[PDB]
């Protein structure tokens, strides 16, 4: 089957290049418009109680808008706010921008709009020393995304109010900055990573145009994937976080997927096979591996569709779309271009890259001239001594494999320890580095006049009869709520608790629905209190609902842990069963799934140490805080899909030598030493693109990027060099065992192509 495609792609090589390069280029312009039609919501359980309790709450009583924007105004010259000239100056400016932007701003409400009012909450908007005061600026827009796009329209004119001296904080200022980091490290990754992945590409090839093709494939893959996600946006919403993931993961491993097609072809040319035959021996040894690599990542990501969060559901689409397209790009495009370039792929060399003024550029001259001087000596000689070093290192391991596996085994287990302190939370201003201008304003806002920031649990009552709800009917539900201790009462009066939620001027006050809300005492108790509140029995007609941001996160935190074992099971069994089909062996997938579970578990214990306890918060500039619930579900699906893939690389060369007649140590040594340079490049290529996104201002992007760079490092070193050879030799001849029915399944399914 795979041999059939290798021979048809050479007979049909000109038409497959034209068809595939056109589609990846067509998605380029289409992917450019994607950056505009993208939704930010999706962190809550799309279909759940706490979620649908906010739908009814925002519908009947009205979507709250007093937290869209808050603006702290301070008069200059140490003038106090009672200065009438200052009040008239700012109020005219505030009325003007509101007058200028009708389709964006709904208005501005605050103490300045009525300087002499008796409503003490509005009166408490000023400060004590009369040095500052703030306002609320509600914004238009029906959905969450429309409101932000409106704020981004009015942000410039709103900051020049009071002559610059105005502090903008609130929900929409934060959302503008958080979604703004997506494009920042996107540029950082294109200024500092695509050159470095290029210098790693010819680090492993000794040829320029050979190195260009994985970058060409890598660049082609994201251009097609970004085109797919903009098409997907027409049906169901896509998240802002999808665009970095395609670059962080899809781009890097698309180069890796192509980094294997060029090298195996050069190895086949190095043996002495002609152009027609070289594409055949590469597809069944690299293309069959690249196909199984991506399908494994697919099988390592579809169990996230079990999770309810639309945030994760959008990501798995991009991960599926990027790696499967990159794999199809690897076989269909990269193999056909090597028949067109033919044996003259290794022609240009470094000296030809020196043609255009890459030397006039500071960085590339140093990189070019080094490869030229090393071309006559260092680049070709060091490869054999490193190939020999890779072979010598493994026999130092296999000489006393227990001496290397046992210290490695105990260390990785000792790193899973901090995972027991995994605190989970939600998005807040803390997701930004504490030196941030917006975060400090929101923090100074909260420190100036406490009591406006509230995360209250809501009780949503709804009858289906349609009759209005009596005050005695409300009194019964309000009576039951007083049994669950732990809700606030600064009034110290039990009647003053669980007030009626404010009603907006935009909600059909269907009297079948009435909602009351009160603020918790300890957010940690939410998981327990919402359980207690949901445990209360409903009224003669109505059905209760527990909502608010605590119930929203605590349900999303909960919704992860339920589907997680079913995810872990589906993930483990589908990755393991796909590795057996690839290797033909059975115990290697069972062994790899251990090492994969050994790698994934150790990495999240480091992340928990440095991100929840803050061992590194002082250096990388962030603040230790409870992690995001869908994030740990994501990073589980990623590390597994990566650890599995790099083990697919190291072992697929051993099944080649084993099924070629060689001994087990021959199979291991052939596997590790012939790849010891390839995987290290693929590791560095990702460690480059991952290193870019690690400097992100968004702490959760730091989390995903560190978890990549950490586990990717362990897969390239401790597992590839040490643990795999140590554990494999203890198996000996057992490494390749397989029941015949299990084999014949692989063999007659068109995939039992064991060796060449
Ligand atoms: C089907 C899902 C519907 C869930 C209900 C959402 C409708 C509006 C709810 C509420 O009025 O405000 C929503 C919360 O917004 C912030 O939380 C985050 O919002 C998005 C993700 O949804 C995120 O991108 C943003 O950066 C966060 O600010 C507030 O923090 C919450 O307090 C609000 O409840
Ligand atoms: C790879 C497969 C591994 C599967 C392992 C599944 C283990 C499930 C563990 C359990 O479900 O979680 C226990 C509780 O953890 C949290 O409790 C704290 O979390 C935060 C912050 O500390 C907070 O929301 C909560 O109040 C804390 O007690 C969850 O929040 C709880 O819901 C879990 O029950």
Residue numbers in the entry: 1 to 756
Direct quotes from the study:
A detailed analysis suggested that MmpL3 is a TMM flippase that is absolutely essential for transporting TMMs across the cell membrane. MmpL3 consists of 12 transmembrane helices (TMs 1 to 12) and 2 periplasmic subdomains (PDs 1 and 2). Our structural data are in line with MD simulations that indicate the major conformational change of the transporter is located at the periplasmic subdomain PD2, where this movement can easily be interpreted as a rigid body rotational motion of PD2 in relation to the PD1 subdomain.
T6D is an ideal ligand to mimic the TMM lipid, as it contains a trehalose moiety and is structurally similar to TMM. Crystals of MmpL3773 bound with T6D diffracted X-rays to a resolution of 3.34 Å. Surprisingly, the data indicate that each asymmetric unit of the crystal contains 2 independent MmpL3773 monomers, where the conformations (MmpL3773-T6D I and MmpL3773-T6D II) are different from each other. Interestingly, the structures of MmpL3773-T6D I and MmpL3773-T6D II are quite different both in the periplasmic and transmembrane domains. Particularly, it is observed that TM9 of MmpL3773-T6D II tilts away from the innermost surface of the cytoplasmic membrane when compared with that of MmpL3773-T6D I. Consistent with the structure of MmpL3773-PE, each MmpL3773-T6D structure is found to create 2 substrate binding sites that are situated at cavities formed by TM7-TM10 in the transmembrane region and between PD1 and PD2 of the periplasmic domain, respectively. Each binding site is occupied by a T6D molecule. It appears that these 2 structures capture different transient states of substrate transport mediated by MmpL3.
